[PDB]
Amino acid sequence: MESLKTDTEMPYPEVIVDVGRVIFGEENRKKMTNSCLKRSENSRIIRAICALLNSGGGVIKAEIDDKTYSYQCHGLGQDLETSFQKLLPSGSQKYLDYMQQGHNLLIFVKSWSPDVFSLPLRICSLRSNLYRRDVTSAINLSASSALELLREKGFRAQRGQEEEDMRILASEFFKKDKLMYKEKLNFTESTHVAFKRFTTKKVIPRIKEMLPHYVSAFANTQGGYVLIGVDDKSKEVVGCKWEKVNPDLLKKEIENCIEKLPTFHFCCEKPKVNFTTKILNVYQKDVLDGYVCVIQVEPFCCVVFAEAPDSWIMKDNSVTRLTAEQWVVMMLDTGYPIKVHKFKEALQRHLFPVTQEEVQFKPESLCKKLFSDHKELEGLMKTLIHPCSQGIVIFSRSWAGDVGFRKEQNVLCDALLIAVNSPVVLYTILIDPNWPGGLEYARNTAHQLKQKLQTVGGYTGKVCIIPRLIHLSSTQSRPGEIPLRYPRSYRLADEEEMEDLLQALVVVSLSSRSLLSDQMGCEFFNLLIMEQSQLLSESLQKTRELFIYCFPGVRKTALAIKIMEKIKDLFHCKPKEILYVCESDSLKDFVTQQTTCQAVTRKTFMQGEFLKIKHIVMDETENFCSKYGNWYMKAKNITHPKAKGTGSENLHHGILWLFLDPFQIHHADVNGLPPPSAQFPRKTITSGIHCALEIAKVMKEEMKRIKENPPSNMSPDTLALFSETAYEEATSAQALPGVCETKTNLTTEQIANYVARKCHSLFQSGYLPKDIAILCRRGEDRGRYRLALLKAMELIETHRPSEVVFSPATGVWGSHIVLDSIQQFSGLERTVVFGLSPECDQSEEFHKLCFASRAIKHLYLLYEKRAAY
Amino acid sequence: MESLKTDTEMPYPEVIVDVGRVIFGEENRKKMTNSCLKRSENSRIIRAICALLNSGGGVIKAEIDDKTYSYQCHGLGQDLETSFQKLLPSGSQKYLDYMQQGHNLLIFVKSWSPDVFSLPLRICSLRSNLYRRDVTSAINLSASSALELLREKGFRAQRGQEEEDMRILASEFFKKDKLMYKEKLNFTESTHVAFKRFTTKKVIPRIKEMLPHYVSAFANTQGGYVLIGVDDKSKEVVGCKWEKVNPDLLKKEIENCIEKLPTFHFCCEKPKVNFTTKILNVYQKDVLDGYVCVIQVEPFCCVVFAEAPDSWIMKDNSVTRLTAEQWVVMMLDTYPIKVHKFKEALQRHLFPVTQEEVQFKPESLCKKLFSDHKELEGLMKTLIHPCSQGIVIFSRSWAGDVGFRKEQNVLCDALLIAVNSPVVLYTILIDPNWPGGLEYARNTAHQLKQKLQTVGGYTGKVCIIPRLIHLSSTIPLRYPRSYRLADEEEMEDLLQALVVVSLSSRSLLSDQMGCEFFNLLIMEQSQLLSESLQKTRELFIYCFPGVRKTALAIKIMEKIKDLFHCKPKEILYVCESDSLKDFVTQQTTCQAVTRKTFMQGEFLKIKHIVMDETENFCSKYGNWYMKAKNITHPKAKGTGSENLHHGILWLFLDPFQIHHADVNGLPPPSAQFPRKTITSGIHCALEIAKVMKEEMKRIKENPPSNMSPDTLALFSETAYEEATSAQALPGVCETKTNLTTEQIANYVARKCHSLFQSGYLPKDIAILCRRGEDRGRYRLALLKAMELIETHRPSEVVFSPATGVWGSHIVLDSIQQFSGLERTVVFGLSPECDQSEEFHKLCFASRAIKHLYLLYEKRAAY
Ligand SMILES: [Zn+2]
Ligand SMILES: [Zn+2]
């Protein structure tokens, strides 16, 4: 199966299992003469249901034999119901919904999501086929008891009396060499002896049919003796006729049966199941009559199966039985960030609120682009949605691409309608209605989206995504008829169900690469920064001077802003009494807009005099230069004032927090800081990493390269505090899927064309120009790159709606693309970063870190060709 | 039941139920003519099993009808086995063991401990009696499914289609006002309609019997209609004869039945179950023939029971059914964890399983008992034989050690734990003619097993066999072989359970394992605190009362030596008292001096300084802080030092226990940064911590002159409660008031004698007096009291100054001389104190680990 299988009559998104012709109805089921057909049909239906439960859900199609059968009047069938109850002890309503359309009965099977309150039963099984022996009975363990036994045996392996009277009597019987006719047994059945239903006219068939059960029961429990040749009622040694079957054939059949038994091993030794078969002779008046067989099974280290556990899955459009190995692996279960599942409720409440207002079109950016490019989309969608007042329509250029699958050019956009008391509907808009593959695209996209919701999102409920195909060129909406019918239980019923589906959509979007993924990632990062700021603020009451060491990608500035707010709250000071000192002007304007507290650059700080400043927070401390003056003593004097006699009854100490990034030092001169031995007390922050996995991986590779061959300016002691293990833990905890690409050996025109094409593609998907940052290492190439980019974007944008405007790094907050040097972009970040740098050898490759620290989710490093002289 | 009930014939420790005469055996069970007796006997046995499972375990005693019945030859019974396997789906062998002695068949029922791999099914139940309607069938939910439904409804309440076609047709049938004879229904049964087995000759008994099931099924699920008067096979409105029963009587019976139904509510509104009963008339050719009753049940917010859930417990020597409220509370469930974290290490250190000869524990009590009674060693060696591997744990009173009464006539109790042996509890009696020995042994064994299962968390079959012995002298209790310990792992698990039980009680063994537990906890805190060595160089550590600063300081010194690779003599400890100096000098290899020695001397090779008792430092000699800074923070001298180093200056501060009114010499509280507040260092009894918290509140409410508001601000009672709950252990704190000197001496002598008889060594007693000039008077009075009490007088009573804390003698010194040192038992002898001077309870309590006896002398008369 590449995508799905074609079914014109019932083009459902889900997988369809055809169980052939079945007889349905209580009266018809009872009056069936053929019991074999009854059992076969029941088995087919139950196997299909189990496979659909373990394979994500689906539809079962059955051709109804009687042409006068109505589900409302007749019913389903009693035996099928007993089977359903056996398979689903919790309840069959939560998973199975029935429907009669035409002459076909459709059973809708929900995916087996283990109930949070219930035991974590990963998969559903009819019978474990793991037998454990209670007193005088061998019980086919249920799924829950099977999990009990598996977990107990696993713990035992990983770690490293009248019952005994029955065992002793059975052992004494075993040791005996010969027996007498009508000799009376002095013991009955127990946990360690079983002899009932074992004597027949033909012993071989009964042994083959029944021995596996008792052998599994004895091996799983402790000990056991199986006796063949003892009459059930009278407990005498009747024996088996010698002429009927010789002892050697019976012994070989027994060893064959025990060898065919499936087994699963928790331990390393992996012993086979061991058993001793001893054949006893019975003599009436010293003439041979027959023989009695005793089988002894010792306790077995792990679980032994009577046969393959009859649990089914779906594999290659077919219902497939699960082997013991597969069953135990799937049952014992022997990684998207947890923070997503912690914050999905707040994210849904912020971005996708369930309100009684009119229908909302999201996301705003893509909606604006689509509606400006196509004027009829607003009207067409408003007409199609009607009648619906409450709901959200989530637009995407390609939902299939949004869930990780192929993107189709012929699909203009996809709309996902979520509403209360309505099914989820996926609208696919086509540029040309004559495109043959629209229906397949819609069906596959709906199937993939539902599967992603259930698997990644964690949705545990009945949801139907109905593929509806629409065209802009059509003057009249809803052409033809839509025959897709689902039970009323599959539409969302309350606002809580809508909230749950939207939270699952939040998780799915945050686990993928898309425009919506990027926007919700920004909101997620805001929440994470709030949590980190709250955690770090606890040091305000315990320290006054602190040296904060930050890994690459920590986002020091947001933490600094929120820490400044926390200082204002805690110390009850006026906002203008807190000073933020940075090195770059651009960061100064950024912070000036983001915070009400005072923000100055180092030159202003040294030139000016700050009498009213009570607390100082310094960022970009690595790049500070001491040529103008020694700023550290100034900050110390403003923060730590020496006592002047008795004038100050209670001298105060302020906050002198310095944020340092040892890795990104671009000033070879001395910083003016105290030596690394005097940089105490210190804190290392690793949990601020807010970027893509790809960008974090690039930054870690550069970190390792720097640590292996440290440069002159950096020192071993500062490099020692940063470990790769902590960086992996933080990245796995806090990073989101993204894009990082590298291109080499390109001319200026090729770089310009690549940037123009990528920007056009991103804009078509709903990215705004404020998310694009084009950064060049060498500042003298700004004009050349600007001319090349103007030419490229003019060529690409043939329609040319508005002029292309690039803004300097000062205008980060504005709505324009940023084209400036890396030095001018220090401390500032944007979602998409284009790094235009000349050809770099191994020595100069360290600037990948500088480029990556500026990118949040996209990073396109482009390298120019070597100049020819 | 005060302790237990007397059973001379079967004196088992456990609770015994008598299920009367029962017929046993497959042949006998099958051939029974009377089915009512069969059902009654099966019900009695299963109810007793359920009660024993939910009530800690016990024994079932059944008298066998047949005198020729042998369990091995015959068996137990098929119906009984099926009932057992119904009650225990996991397995009946783990909980039920059978045994035949005499004419009685005994069933040994283990306590229902929910398996760690299991769903948390707290109690066992035959039937939930909670019904959930699958389509066409109403199912009595199992215990697990009942728990699932209860949790779902609780979460829902706390938070705040052809099936639909069936419902619509049923609603249309409901709305109809008239019916025709042999009118064919156009619908069959679904999740929302049920009418099978409802039409009988006498409708009322069948309704009374079956209606609760369907009402519960409909209420628990969504909606439902019940139809009365429809023939099963042909689906036509046969109707109920009008003469047989009037509609009003049937309606009132339905209302009575529905009202009688038990219910449990997860919500505050508490609505009753709502339902509409409508009576429909059937006419054949317009003449009345009968009537049809339709009952509508709407979805109901909470769970509705068909009847009281048949789960039983034990209450007042009786098998008692559980009501719905009790069952739901017990099923939904609506001591420090560090004990369960450290019990394995504690048992490996203190009760190791080895192939060596049997070990007698604890050593102190064993020495006392064997010295006082010479024959006890030989008697125990004889009784234990044949046994090589095992531990014998001695107690003056195991009953007292598990919280129950102490008996004077019991010399001691020995608990024998061994592999391939039952646990045996030996009670030694001074006078063998004491009537109550057997009852004492039985009750003690019962209480010890119950404590093990409940507090200790033991999940396994254990038998504690009461055995009574007498020193002056020159058993029918039979348990299944599964009740004896089988492996070394089972012995280890039982020993871990015993460790938890004793750490959850008050005894000598409790105190010794408390000391080991506190050592492990201090190791964990020291490891956690040592992380600040890499992040800070000068630190001001603020400690709540009872933090045990000195042990943390010693382990921090060790961590400094490990981290900075410095010689032990390069790390310096500065304290104020000579006694703590000597203590630390013995406990550590690093240099330890007092403040006077620190200021007089010169320390060239010292690279790191750790200071304790910093609140009591006096600046009259000079500025010790500046000296510490100069030693730890050296100013650069030109280019001589290529890489200047900064040392560690860690100051341990206790703001509450400031006894020097003069300025400490510390920097002002605004310059005391960076700072750390240690809360998780509290290692004492709950009672001592409570006294310290009360004194803390009293001090915070009325702060004295020397302390400052900023210093008191960091100490909150929420943190103190969290710490005390996390890391404190049960203990004793007592206060006596208005006693004269000889009464105080007699009290101390009597308490010391009682503690010594229980195995306490003299090194665990510290007698501390607030006023130092009373030391001689108290010493004379205590010597007189102790010589009067110890009539035997084996050895002289020796009191040691506070310098000799490490020695094996009672300490009699002032509180000032005992600063920074602790002992298990502390006696506080102080004069009468008013509200202003009550603050010294904190000083007295900081010196006690598990026992504190504050004694106040009478006011002096002039
Ligand atoms: Zn194995
Ligand atoms: Zn309620």
Numbering used by the authors:
A (entry chain A): 1 to 160, 178 to 351, 378 to 912
B (entry chain B): 1 to 160, 178 to 351, 379 to 518, 525 to 912
Text lifted from the article:
To reveal the structural details underpinning the function of SLFN14, we determined the cryo‐EM structures of the full‐length human SLFN14 apoenzyme. Because wild‐type (WT) SLFN14 protein was not suitable for single‐particle analysis, primarily because it strongly aggregated on the cryo‐EM grid, we introduced four mutations, i.e., E211A, C365S, C775S, and C808S into SLFN14 (denoted SLFN14mut) to circumvent this problem. SLFN14mut was more stable and soluble, which allowed us to perform 3D reconstruction of the sample using ≈0.96 million particles, yielding an interpretable EM density map with an overall resolution of 2.84 Å that was suitable for model building. The cryo‐EM structure of apo SLFN14mut features a dimer with an overall fold similar to that of the SLFN11 dimer. SLFN14 harbors a zinc‐finger module located at the C‐lobe of the RNase domain, where a zinc ion is coordinated by residues C318, C319, H282, and C284. Additionally, the ID‐helix in SLFN14 blocks access to the ATP‐binding pocket, as observed previously for the autoinhibited ATPase conformation observed in SLFN11. By contrast, in the SLFN14 apoenzyme structure, K213, R214, and F215 on Loop 211–220 are shifted away from the active site, suggesting the SLFN14 apoenzyme structure may represent the RNase inactive state of the enzyme.
Herein, we carried out a systematic characterization of the enzymatic activities of human SLFN14, revealing that SLFN14 has RNase activity that cleaves RNAs containing double‐strand regions. By determining cryogenic electron microscopy (cryo‐EM) structures of SLFN14 apoenzyme and SLNF14 bound to a short hairpin RNA, we demonstrate that SLFN14 assembles into a ring‐like homodimer, and that an RNA‐binding groove formed by the two SLFN14‐NTD domains can accommodate a short hairpin RNA of ∼12 bp. The SLFN14 RNase domain is followed by a linker domain (366‐571 aa) and a superfamily I helicase domain (572‐912 aa).
